[PDB]
């Protein structure tokens, strides 16, 4: 159970609540609760005293010059939900909305937001009950409009607000009746407390980072399989090389490779600096093998940097104005700008493209007899069935997906419109669509990694057959990559045996079904993910 | 003075040597000098014993399958200079080439490259004598070809090598004569020791990072001028706001802006928390002022991350193979792949475009009476000459430059050709052209920042006039921005005066001349750079 | 000789005047010359009568709300030169500036601009005398600022204007003195007549289109060399194939390749339709040969479309307001927006990157023995000197240039700033920087094509040798590609000979010198350009 108010949330915390339905509860720490209440009292007294506060006793953004009376102060926040009910396009994944709610709640616990504890708690109840508001993919320039949908569902403002109640679509007032809750009415500032901020884009981004850390670990395993299938050397990953060029990510990737290849019987074992003289001539490994740590270093380091930045944002107070009860003051600031998210997700998409292109080049070596060091063309299985073309179709599909991934590696934060919202929002982060685009990259990268996994699994079977009599690669692989191999072969439903490789005749499988099954297992955190669990 | 190989080099160190002609010397540490010699010993014995070593007793890259005898091993390295080099197209700044020679020599001191000390010393001599080999902008997929022009010049291989000898173009053999040096012939491995590696792209990147750090400080100062001109508040930068979203770069940007604005007579001083008129009523600032530290944060942190990555690359051993004397072995590795440089410069150009775009929307506020809070249209000075249009042309020029900077913020590392060099280099970093594009970005950004300074300086004069009798902003400005303001007007040669603003009639200056003077001063590290020295 | 305004100007016409110094003269057509005078008459009466006309009796752009009297109307135009111009940063090729003055003068002959004939004649005098005003590369969001440097120079406004007087830098007033001309002062509207419009960006674009058409022809010739070197078939270009997919550009590319390859002794001549060995068995060509006309088609048609669009822009009236003498009226319109240029150059740069990428994969086939069908590795000439590595360095340099060209194939028109010039210019074309980026693209492409020519020439020599006794490819080549081959080797100064290929030892040339010579020749319209003259 994740406790919200007392500690810092991690990306892993957010993914557990978001995807695994881990329960959540608000802290009962007495000072935190008091800070929450103090914040509301300050706002209550300011409104009554006719203190002028943008968005609380006056209008919003470019219409903040519009005066709002005390009698209309609550109605201002309520109406904020209505004129923001303007989303468009497809729905977010529920897991992203759950993440959004968890972050919104966390942000309120700091007590600078002036929102009722009963309203914070409503997010805890939705999360634990399995109620997820629908939220559209269009509407935020980086999260008013997405958040208004969460807000209107929480307070049950109107039947046009829809929720998913454990797989059941229904309207929000109906959901409140089932939970035995009452409709809520927003008090001054509460609308801004719910809707001003970065919770959705950061929630999306958090899940993207989690998914990409996992996909990177799996990618490392694929490369390890590729290297073993190509009969490449492990000399490339020797600590002496990387200690003298000590980028943290290069160091890490090289050292992870040593572990991944340790006790393999398929690599050239040359860590003593000397050629093994076991095949018919001396081979040098191409750059995609030799320069693998240098290439992945900045990606590994970048993802780690994004993860650090996204975790600050997770634990940030992001609405506005901010209430300082210690000095009885409020400040008109800008924490609702999700610039670390916009730029971070630009970087992430770019990194995913770089990962994919490197993997596709490995596949090009495996598939091509000129470069595969003895592997059959296109990793053909049954040689006596001449019509067999092996994994030729699977490569083309790989070739169709990677460039799309580099395409999404283009940036969007730099294309923000400077005329936005009556020229009030003349900079903005484009963080929201940047995050949804990242979700798209990650989803596509999951299919891509599935394909790469299939190539590596076939390939080590065929290499094993070259080295030994037979096709069961389990004995021959390094123990670390044996777990992944076996996990893939389990998920796909094709057991390793000494007499057949993973793929034998083109006739005997739909490769598409194997792609879908591996992808689904990666996304679910199945045995493939668990196989590479130790690569942090 | 800068001692090469007993201490890590910083980016400041590199810029001092490259730009300011700081003297350089090789360490006399007895241990270091033995490492350098032991490395040569190992190699020249390995070759004499007929060990197979790629690139040393064998051909290069895709032609590593070609065996090279004991007797041709030396000529192998000499010929590498001929086919490699002399593949080049257009021409790079001498300071970048000086940076490269410093980096190359620095990497050799580690004692793993198997290169003669007198070859290393020749880079020291060239640096202190001011002999700079000509290097072309095309030829490296990320430094064989660039480094070979340096190598051919150092050893005085042929008259077709041009150097710049403190201003004098010469052929290299002639430069050697005047320095009283003999030509050198490369021994086995020494060609690779000179031409394998990331020294030139990293040399370029290092100067770019240094310049971009300077421009970020100046940009901070420009924003501080803009805010004062616009009668903005300092409330947005209150630490209560930023402590509750504690990204390091955001915290830093807000704190710096507090310092930059302290004791200004031109800002609305609302750090109390409460409002009221010295203008309209209540005034709400637009996002480009209010969300400034949120926006600059990831740019600041990003430049800092690149800085840290480039300093590691600066102090790395990047040639190949690497000689490990303690275990008497060579390793065929890949430290010549400068992925941190190709990706880092992709990020740098992207950050610079975001800085420029933000500055440009401040210029839009300043120029437009709807948004300037009482400044004249286009920062017009003499309103009585009605044909005056003020800084309208200056704005258009700004508007033409900023989009070009976001254009250069496109990435190039992801567009690497997988068929490079006989399909041997099937991944590569594009780090060299990434770095020269960054240089182009930085150079354009110096022009842009010049314009933005001109806008800020004019504007505070006009705001001062609105407020007081006069046009001399020096007394009204925060002391921090007064330093910058005076420095700018010192450079353009237009003295502050209580009777006239910086720009009075359109008649009286070529603004093009002011831009050029301010840019030159920024490039030379002049008084404008010295005014913002405080900003780390 | 080129007569300005009684005939449409073509892109050939523009290049002849800009590059070859062709003499120019204004039409003496009595009707045209009356139109020009009637236009001035209308305007100078309208002003004298106090008509409100934007930019004529009122301020400019966002300051059009400022009224300008009869008495200051002339000074209004003179001052436009001062605030506009003199907003500029870095410097453009004289030929582009000559193109601009031709275009500007050409637009005035239509008689709708209200500008004095002696002002128009001054562009004629400058062109024929070889006086070229200095113009900077920054300042236009797509030509006020560039055109104002031309204007100030033409009228001799101030010594701060520099011109190039056939090689001599001068101030403009001094150039006027030597030409025996008086300074001019602008009359109402004449400033706009000179500085409103798309003449400079279109002048640049025109030279780019001309150069790109040349390089496309040369590229066709390079492919024809590549195909012959690779022992490719001409079957792929059979009209039965292309008639059944009849895109004009594809039809054209296939037919041209048939001509380029006719009577070659180096291709497999399979236009019959049936196969067989003069090699392996049956040989299938890869897509870069087989799909060549399908690939080049849209590039060819695209360049042709741009050509047609630019010629309309060339012959357009682009200033404002436009005087319609027949109805005695002015129209406030928008012909100064050069969207066809900003978008056309976006497309051009994109096409050029696609041409380069295609050429680069041919170079990969040539360099690699797995794919070259029997050519030596890296097109090595003297195989007995084992330290020779042939064109390996040349390939790497090619590999560094091509990705930069696809990089410049990114677009800039979509990145226009909507806040430009007091929010008056809330759309703009970015046409000027689009065009200067195209110039940068074209210039880099000339270097790239040089490399590709060097590869093709070497390769056919080596293929000829495989086939016959000797290295002289002249007899074996199709007559069409023999012209190109000889032209290239004339330029680099290495005569075909039966005993030695173009490149024998790495020892014996600086390949950098060959690239530079071939590029210079391509730029100057030399023998290499004349060899491919036949390709329309
Ligand atoms: O704080 C601001 O400047 C904008 C707040 C806001 C709230 C709801 C809609 C638009 C803007
Ligand atoms: O593969 C390598 O490590 C060397 C590649 C290379 C290519 C051309 C010249 C020197 C080295
Ligand atoms: O809006 C227009 O048509 C003119 C814009 C303009 C701006 C600055 C100088 C001349 C014209």
Residue numbers in the entry:
A (entry chain B), B (entry chain A), C (entry chain A): 25 to 166, 170 to 563
Question: What do the authors say?
Answer:
Enzymes with phenylalanine ammonia lyase (PAL) activity are able to catalyse non-oxidative deamination to yield cinnamate (1a) and ammonia from the proteinogenic amino acid L-phenylalanine (L-Phe, 2a). PALs also find use in the area of green chemistry and sustainable pharmaceutical manufacture as industrial biocatalysts, due to the reversibility of the deamination reaction. Although several crystal structures of PAL enzymes have been solved, none exists with the natural ligand trans-cinnamic acid bound in the active site, thereby preventing correct and unambiguous assignment of the phenylalanine-specific MIO-dependent ammonia lyase zymophore.
